[PDB]
Symmetry: D2
Subunit: 108 residues, 4 copies
């Protein structure tokens, strides 16, 4: 999938993907955007811990947590509580949008 | 694709899709969300014109336009100018989120 | 997903999808190919049973089974035992190909 | 897309993708299967030419050609003329299946 919704987490080894782009939460705690095999962007936090998870929070903050729940890296975009999405876009940009402004209200 | 970015248009017959969900801009100008063959939601504007297109504007407004560029239906969420996305989500909700709060800045 | 591999089954309500095309195993036991809301092809076996499942067998036969495991419809392409795939193609054709002729051998 | 149909070609830089798997026809003429950034399989023909293209032929043969149309590598599965598909499967195997055994005949 190419979208991480607020309230969701990407566990170790999990990722967002689109075409040849992979945004992965690595086991060495480095969050990396790859274009095939080339690292395009990273949090540069590899080695600081093991088995981190990525959380797209309801306050709009994207945070990498270690098992002890200490924040290793954050987008520092926390703020208003609502619904947000982190998207790995077709143009290779990873963007956080929010909050929701309109909906059809057809959610199950 | 399941995302319509601001600055984009879905021409007549074009759509957003995810699994069995299809959000289509029909030729009879009705914008309909289908779950397989069942209409789940619609703007109920079929017959009011022919060959309409759907525009996700930079002001956050989702508008259905007829060829003469007159708005047939709108979400009425127009406002701040920026970047927005209209997503046909995995939970079957069609939602508009915006503006962008953070990005890796890796866009080509 | 747009591929049903041999050894797999699509339970009631499950489907293959690609763009606006949905090949679904309905609860009324009718196997239907939809292009948005229009039925393009069907086995025309709706009502003959309830809760059927679709099986892409290892003998290359695509069979619709009722709960009592009696074949309601079949492609009648059963034959050589091997690996087959039933694909809902981008050109809107649903095709069974097989057997395998070559592989990288990189399966987990 | 995760399927290369017979009669199609993947030009230089083009690829098949599924999840974190990328089967790419590189500009250095090496055909490589990547699992994120790790090479899982390759034809090991990098440097033998520039700007090769991958062809899934109607005779069931998968061939890497250089601009001068000389075969750099082949699966050597050429044979019966018909319809074939090369699939980058969900189980990380890249497999060629063919020929077609059955179809709904709903192709546009
Ligand atoms: O250009 C962005 C960024 O790229 C490089 O950082 C990304 C790499 O950071 C670390 O070196 C690792 O996390 C590495 O990950 C690979 O190696 C790991 C250790 O062998 C392995 O566990 C992983 O599976 C993966 O293969 C990242 O690829 C670096 O150039 C940065 O300076 C730069 O900002
Ligand atoms: O915020 C007040 C509201 O909170 C609690 O309900 C939360 C749900 O409210 C609605 O049903 C939806 O907004 C639902 O979320 C869906 O729609 C969103 C956009 O409309 C979208 O962003 C989500 O992804 C999802 O599809 C909320 O989850 C509850 O306490 C209510 O009583 C209260 O009024
Ligand atoms: O429950 C939501 C909504 O569903 C129904 O409206 C959707 C239908 O609206 C019109 O009837 C048409 O636009 C129809 O579209 C189909 O028929 C067209 C005309 O034959 C055809 O051109 C299209 O390709 C399509 O097959 C929509 O499906 C209705 O029950 C609403 O009351 C209700 O709000
Ligand atoms: O707004 C001021 C800015 O406007 C003009 O540039 C617009 C581009 O600015 C950045 O490069 C990006 O924001 C780019 O959009 C990409 O990133 C967004 C999030 O960062 C994302 O929502 C988009 O989808 C896209 O990936 C903008 O397009 C120009 O006049 C600048 O000089 C000026 O500073
Ligand atoms: O052109 C192909 C084929 O189309 C038509 O058959 C498909 C329909 O067959 C039955 O009528 C039903 O299975 C129907 O399914 C819909 O209705 C069901 C009952 O209301 C419902 O449970 C399903 O969810 C679905 O909405 C199929 O759509 C028919 O014209 C054939 O002659 C023709 O061969
Ligand atoms: O047929 C003889 C063989 O059968 C049993 O092994 C079956 C597996 O054999 C290989 O490992 C693979 O073929 C594997 O299937 C993978 O590759 C196929 C193409 O190579 C592909 O179609 C499949 O989808 C899958 O990716 C088979 O599952 C076993 O009894 C062996 O001892 C015996 O030699
Ligand atoms: O385990 C499979 C296979 O892996 C390795 O071969 C794959 C690599 O082969 C060559 O080294 C290159 O084609 C390389 O491609 C990368 O480097 C290129 C040159 O810098 C660059 O142009 C490409 O974009 C790409 O980044 C492949 O990755 C090797 O270990 C084999 O022995 C082994 O069989
Ligand atoms: O082989 C004899 C036949 O060849 C020429 O027609 C080729 C087309 O024939 C059918 O229309 C289809 O098979 C079509 O291919 C579609 O269906 C295939 C399975 O049925 C599938 O594999 C393909 O991907 C495609 O969807 C062929 O392309 C022509 O000379 C005919 O006159 C002649 O009888
Ligand atoms: O080290 C990374 C950042 O860690 C902290 O920010 C994370 C926290 O921010 C907000 O308090 C909430 O969103 C919390 O849920 C979240 O954990 C700060 O120290 C920040 O400055 C760091 O950049
Ligand atoms: O008939 C549908 C709506 O049409 C108009 O709104 C559309 C316009 O809204 C803003 O002015 C901008 O976003 C424009 O680009 C857009 O066309 C209004 O009449 C509204 O009340 C209607 O609901
Ligand atoms: O009624 C549909 C078809 O049912 C039977 O064929 C299904 C069986 O075919 C082969 O025997 C095997 O592949 C079995 O696994 C499969 O169930 C036949 O009666 C056929 O004539 C019908 O068309
Ligand atoms: O060097 C790779 C292979 O090249 C040749 O095979 C490719 C040719 O095979 C069949 O003749 C047809 O499918 C042709 O279209 C195709 O180009 C052979 O030399 C083979 O032995 C090599 O392995």
């Amino acid at each position: 999938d190419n979208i991480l919704y607020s309230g969701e987490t990407l566990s170790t080894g999990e990722f967002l993907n689109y075409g040849s782009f992979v945004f992965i939460m690595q086991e060495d705690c480095n969050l990396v955007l790859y274009d095939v095999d080339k690292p395009i962007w990273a949090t540069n936090t590899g080695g600081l811990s093991r088995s981190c998870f990525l959380s797209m929070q309801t306050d709009g903050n994207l945070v990498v947590y270690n098992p002890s729940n200490k924040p290793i890296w954050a987008s520092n975009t926390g703020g208003q509580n609502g619904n947000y999405v982190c998207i790995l876009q077709k143009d290779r940009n990873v963007v956080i949008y929010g909050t929701d402004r309109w909906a059809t209200g057809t959610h199950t």
